Amino acid sequence: DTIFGKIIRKEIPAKIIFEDDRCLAFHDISPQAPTHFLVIPKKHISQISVAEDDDESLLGHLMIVGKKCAADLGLNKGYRMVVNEGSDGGQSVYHVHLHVLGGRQMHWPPG
Amino acid sequence: DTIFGKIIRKEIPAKIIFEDDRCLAFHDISPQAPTHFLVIPKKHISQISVAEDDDESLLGHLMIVGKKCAADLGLNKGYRMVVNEGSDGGQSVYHVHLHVLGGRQMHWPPG
Numbered sequence: 001d002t003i004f005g006k007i008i009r010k011e012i013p014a015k016i017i018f019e020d021d022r023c024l025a026f027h028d029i030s031p032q033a034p035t036h037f038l039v040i041p042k043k044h045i046s047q048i049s050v051a052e053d054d055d056e057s058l059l060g061h062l063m064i065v066g067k068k069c070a071a072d073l074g075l076n077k078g079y080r081m082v083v084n085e086g087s088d089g090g091q092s093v094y095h096v097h098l099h100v101l102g103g104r105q106m107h108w109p110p111g
Numbered sequence: 112d113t114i115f116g117k118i119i120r121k122e123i124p125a126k127i128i129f130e131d132d133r134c135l136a137f138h139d140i141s142p143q144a145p146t147h148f149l150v151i152p153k154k155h156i157s158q159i160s161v162a163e164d165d166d167e168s169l170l171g172h173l174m175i176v177g178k179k180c181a182a183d184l185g186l187n188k189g190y191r192m193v194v195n196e197g198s199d200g201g202q203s204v205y206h207v208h209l210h211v212l213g214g215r216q217m218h219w220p221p222g
Contacts, residue, residue, distance in 0.1 A: 032220030048178050048192065060171030063194070067159050070196070078197020081159065082221045083174070085181070086189025090219050101221065106201045109143035110193050110210070111218035 004095045008042055017069045022061055025069045025100075034103020035073050039066040046094040048085050062098045075102040080110065115151055115206040128180050134173060136180045145214020146184055150177040156207040159196050173209045181211050191217040 007014045008024050015027030017037055028036040039062045045051050051059060063081065070079050079102035084091040090111070118125045119135055126138035128148055138148040150173045156162050162170060174192065181190050190213030195202040201222065 048174065049182065049189075051175065051178065053175055056171035056175050057168045058171065059174045060167035060169065063159065063170045063174075064162065064164060064167050067162060067196075071160060075196075075199075078195075078199030078202065080196065080200045080221065081194035083192040084189070084217065084221075085178070085186075085191065085213075088186075088189035088213055088216050089191045090217050091189060099221065102199055105199055106195070107222040108201055110191065110212065110222040111220060 002093055002095050004040060004093055004097070005044075008040075017072065018065060020065070022058060023065050025065055028099065033101040033106070035070075035075060035079075035101070036103075037069065037073075037100050038097045039063075039069065039100060040095065040097040045096040047091060048083055048096055051096065062096075066098050066100045070100050070102060073102070078102065078106075080106045082110070112155055113204050113206045115204050115208065116155065119151070119153055128184070129176060131176070133169060134176055136176055139210070144190075144212040144217070146181075146186055146190065147210065147212045147214075148180065148184070150174075150180070150209040150211065152207050157205045158202060159194055159207055162207065170207075173207075177209055177211045181213060184213075186211075186213040189213065189217075191221065193221070
């Protein structure tokens, strides 16, 4: 369940930007940029390393939802899409979630 | 097009990791981590903000391939996946590309 499950279950409140039969995009509570949100699959996939080849269209779906919400958020100057795998990736929640950061200049390297 | 085009075209060398009929994975020339390689679409989508809703499985396919290469490359302790959009996003080349970074701990915020 994590907090993700409870949020999707609307058990607990989130700054929901978007929703459809496949995902939930809500604002990241500990933003690392002016605008920071997460686009996550309602379906549980702990980490990208274990995403199946049939999981393919959902991953790209998270990606498209991300690009739509970001434009919705007026992110016309740009943004950075992120997914963190495991320990070195700094994966906090073991449920696949796509980070979207904007509102400012991102730097190289990406952490 | 871009250098990514000529790379796809075999015009200029590249440290190729995997190829199939729709995409190419190869090492980043200026790596930002022990393992830093990219996954790019043969179809020239200039950037994610423009990607057709038809590019959804393709954009998912990138991520799929990516995590596969990360696994073939032995990245079993995690890594980070990145998609830079526009100036704020710090998009170096205007042709959709997915970063995969590992070999070391990735920090938060992600740039």
